């Protein structure tokens, strides 16, 4: 039990590790490959199934 709500989940950090490498790399094809791979691979690892689109 001992269940309690929280914010700033570790999931964005796993993505952060990727995007850290993705962003660090510079170019055309290289940039795009890390942009999706990091976004899709890590998003899936979250366990989330419902995608929501940020406004603005």
Coordinates of N, CA, C and O in Angstrom, one line a residue:
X1 N 0.9 -1.2 0.0 CA 0.0 0.0 0.0 C 0.9 1.2 0.0 O 1.7 1.5 -0.9
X2 N 0.7 2.1 1.0 CA 1.5 3.3 1.2 C 1.5 4.1 -0.1 O 2.4 4.9 -0.4
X3 N 0.5 3.9 -0.9 CA 0.3 4.6 -2.2 C 0.1 6.1 -2.0 O -0.7 6.5 -1.1
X4 N 0.9 6.9 -2.8 CA 0.8 8.4 -2.7 C 1.0 9.0 -4.1 O 1.9 8.6 -4.8
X5 N 0.2 10.1 -4.5 CA 0.4 10.7 -5.8 C 1.7 11.5 -5.8 O 2.3 11.9 -4.8
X6 N 2.2 11.8 -7.0 CA 3.5 12.5 -7.2 C 3.5 13.2 -8.6 O 2.8 12.9 -9.5
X7 N 4.5 14.1 -8.7 CA 4.7 14.8 -10.0 C 6.2 14.7 -10.3 O 7.0 14.3 -9.5
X8 N 6.5 15.0 -11.6 CA 7.9 15.0 -12.1 C 8.4 13.5 -12.1 O 9.3 13.1 -11.4
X9 N 7.7 12.7 -12.9 CA 8.0 11.2 -12.9 C 9.3 10.9 -13.5 O 9.8 11.7 -14.4
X10 N 10.0 9.8 -13.2 CA 11.4 9.4 -13.7 C 11.3 9.2 -15.3 O 12.4 9.1 -15.9
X11 N 10.1 9.1 -15.8 CA 10.0 8.8 -17.3 C 10.6 9.9 -18.1 O 11.2 9.6 -19.1
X12 N 10.4 11.2 -17.8 CA 11.0 12.3 -18.5 C 12.5 12.3 -18.5 O 13.2 12.8 -19.4
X13 N 13.1 11.7 -17.4 CA 14.6 11.6 -17.2 C 15.1 10.6 -18.2 O 16.2 10.8 -18.8
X14 N 14.5 9.4 -18.4 CA 14.9 8.4 -19.3 C 14.9 9.0 -20.7 O 15.9 8.9 -21.5
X15 N 13.9 9.8 -21.0 CA 13.8 10.5 -22.3 C 14.9 11.6 -22.3 O 15.6 11.8 -23.4
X16 N 15.2 12.2 -21.2 CA 16.2 13.2 -21.1 C 17.6 12.7 -21.4 O 18.4 13.4 -22.1
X17 N 17.9 11.4 -21.0 CA 19.1 10.8 -21.4 C 19.3 10.7 -22.9 O 20.3 11.0 -23.5
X18 N 18.2 10.3 -23.5 CA 18.2 10.2 -25.0 C 18.3 11.5 -25.7 O 19.3 11.7 -26.4
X19 N 17.4 12.4 -25.4 CA 17.4 13.7 -26.0 C 18.7 14.4 -25.7 O 19.1 15.2 -26.5
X20 N 19.3 14.1 -24.6 CA 20.6 14.7 -24.3 C 21.6 14.3 -25.4 O 22.3 15.2 -25.9
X21 N 21.6 13.0 -25.8 CA 22.4 12.5 -26.9 C 21.9 13.0 -28.2 O 22.7 13.4 -29.1
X22 N 20.6 13.0 -28.4 CA 19.9 13.4 -29.6 C 20.3 14.9 -30.0 O 20.7 15.2 -31.1
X23 N 20.1 15.7 -29.0 CA 20.3 17.2 -29.1 C 21.8 17.4 -29.2 O 22.2 18.3 -30.0
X24 N 22.6 16.7 -28.5 CA 24.1 16.8 -28.6 C 24.6 16.6 -30.0 O 25.5 17.4 -30.5
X25 N 24.0 15.6 -30.7 CA 24.4 15.4 -32.1 C 23.8 16.4 -33.0 O 22.7 16.9 -32.7
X26 N 24.5 16.8 -34.0 CA 24.0 17.8 -34.9 C 24.2 17.4 -36.4 O 25.2 16.7 -36.8
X27 N 23.1 17.7 -37.2 CA 23.1 17.3 -38.6 C 21.7 17.2 -39.1 O 20.7 17.7 -38.4
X28 N 21.5 16.6 -40.2 CA 20.1 16.5 -40.8 C 19.5 15.1 -40.5 O 18.6 15.1 -39.7
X29 N 20.0 14.1 -41.1 CA 19.5 12.7 -40.8 C 19.7 12.3 -39.4 O 18.8 11.6 -38.8
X30 N 20.9 12.6 -38.8 CA 21.2 12.2 -37.4 C 20.2 12.8 -36.4 O 19.8 12.2 -35.5
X31 N 19.9 14.1 -36.6 CA 19.0 14.8 -35.8 C 17.6 14.2 -35.8 O 17.0 14.0 -34.7
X32 N 17.1 13.9 -36.9 CA 15.8 13.3 -37.1 C 15.7 11.9 -36.5 O 14.6 11.6 -35.9
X33 N 16.7 11.1 -36.7 CA 16.7 9.7 -36.2 C 16.6 9.7 -34.7 O 15.8 8.9 -34.1
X34 N 17.4 10.5 -34.0 CA 17.3 10.6 -32.5 C 16.1 11.3 -32.0 O 15.6 11.0 -30.9
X35 N 15.5 12.2 -32.8 CA 14.3 12.9 -32.4 C 13.1 12.0 -32.2 O 12.5 12.0 -31.2
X36 N 12.9 11.1 -33.2 CA 11.8 10.2 -33.1 C 12.1 9.0 -32.2 O 11.4 8.8 -31.2
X37 N 13.2 8.3 -32.4 CA 13.6 7.2 -31.6 C 13.5 7.4 -30.2 O 12.9 6.6 -29.4
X38 N 14.1 8.5 -29.7 CA 14.1 8.9 -28.3 C 12.6 9.2 -27.9 O 12.2 8.8 -26.8
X39 N 11.9 9.9 -28.7 CA 10.5 10.2 -28.4 C 9.5 9.0 -28.3 O 8.7 8.9 -27.4
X40 N 9.7 8.1 -29.3 CA 8.8 6.9 -29.3 C 9.3 5.8 -28.4 O 8.5 5.2 -27.7
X41 N 10.6 5.5 -28.4 CA 11.2 4.5 -27.6 C 10.9 4.7 -26.1 O 10.4 3.9 -25.4
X42 N 11.3 5.9 -25.7 CA 11.1 6.3 -24.3 C 9.6 6.5 -23.9 O 9.2 6.1 -22.7
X43 N 8.8 7.1 -24.8 CA 7.4 7.3 -24.4 C 6.7 5.9 -24.2 O 6.0 5.8 -23.2
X44 N 7.1 4.9 -25.0 CA 6.5 3.6 -24.8 C 7.0 3.0 -23.5 O 6.2 2.3 -22.8
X45 N 8.2 3.2 -23.1 CA 8.8 2.7 -21.9 C 8.0 3.2 -20.7 O 8.0 2.6 -19.6
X46 N 7.4 4.4 -20.8 CA 6.6 5.0 -19.7 C 5.5 4.0 -19.3 O 5.0 4.1 -18.1
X47 N 5.0 3.3 -20.3 CA 3.8 2.4 -20.1 C 2.5 3.2 -20.4 O 1.5 2.6 -20.4
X48 N 2.6 4.5 -20.8 CA 1.5 5.2 -21.2 C 1.0 4.7 -22.5 O 1.7 4.4 -23.4
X49 N -0.4 4.7 -22.7 CA -1.0 4.3 -24.0 C -1.8 5.4 -24.6 O -2.1 5.4 -25.8
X50 N -2.2 6.4 -23.8 CA -3.0 7.6 -24.3 C -2.2 8.8 -24.5 O -1.6 9.4 -23.6
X51 N -2.1 9.2 -25.8 CA -1.3 10.3 -26.2 C -2.1 11.6 -26.1 O -3.3 11.6 -26.6
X52 N -1.6 12.7 -25.6 CA -2.2 13.9 -25.4 C -1.4 15.0 -26.1 O -0.1 15.0 -26.0
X53 N -2.0 15.9 -26.8 CA -1.3 17.0 -27.5 C -1.3 18.3 -26.7 O -2.4 18.8 -26.4
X54 N -0.1 18.8 -26.4 CA 0.0 20.1 -25.7 C -0.5 21.2 -26.6 O -0.3 21.3 -27.8
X55 N -1.2 22.2 -25.9 CA -1.8 23.3 -26.6 C -0.7 24.4 -26.8 O 0.4 24.2 -26.4
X56 N -1.1 25.5 -27.4 CA -0.2 26.6 -27.6 C 1.0 26.2 -28.5 O 1.7 27.1 -28.9

